[PDB]
Amino acid sequence: EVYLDRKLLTLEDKELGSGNFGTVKKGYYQMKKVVKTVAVKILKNEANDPALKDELLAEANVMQQLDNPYIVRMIGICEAESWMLVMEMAELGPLNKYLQQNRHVKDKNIIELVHQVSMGMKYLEESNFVHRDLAARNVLLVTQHYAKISDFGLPVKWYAPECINYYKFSSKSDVWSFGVLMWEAFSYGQKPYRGMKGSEVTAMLEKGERMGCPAGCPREMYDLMNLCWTYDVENRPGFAAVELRLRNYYYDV
């Protein structure tokens, strides 16, 4: 039953995150003999907009009809003192913030994590789902060796050129964002195109220029980022090609 019993759920007073339309808190959902740690998105509806409740429910339906090990999964919905979306807890939080704080993580560890992300993306691609906001801030870590894609806003610097010029989003558009995500990861959560305005990024890319190889980044991986950054979408690989290339590389090394 996706509808959860409120008596079985206990929340912490502190918020992990917040926004205009919701708050995320840590909680515990009571199960048979064990207790499960969960993240709960509590809806904030200060203008009493029935469309807001429908969005929370639409988002829960997607989480459910989109289920894979490399995506944040839905536990259920809880119609309590507020509408709540209960999901798995990704303890370590966002990838970019994690890497900024843990400079000891090795290049091998970062290949394993982005390969998992390429696995969740290969999955959304097969379901004909376009994320549109893939970035390191939307990869949440369960452990240092286990990443899950999330979609908080279900960002010009993560956009493929054909998104800016023609607003054409596709899985190949998501492949370009994945390339920026890999650059963020091997850079340890550094901001891409730092200090540049979104217009300067566009002009830089149309000159055939791309971000350099981050320090310590294996060359093979930088080569994959550059392929993710192929200007002409026709020639840009999809996620099946990207994931397979990552898989082989991670299984060899």
Ligand SMILES: COc1cc2nccc(Oc3ccc(NC(=O)N[C@@H]4C[C@H]4c4ccccc4)nc3)c2cc1OC
């Ligand atoms: C302390 O670290 C934190 C740990 C967290 N663990 C799990 C979930 C968290 O927040 C959320 C809240 C809402 C969402 N919605 C979400 O993705 N819907 C979109 C439809 C589903 C989706 C997923 C993948 C790809 C496309 C769409 N996803 C994470 C967490 C937040 C945290 O800190 C703020």
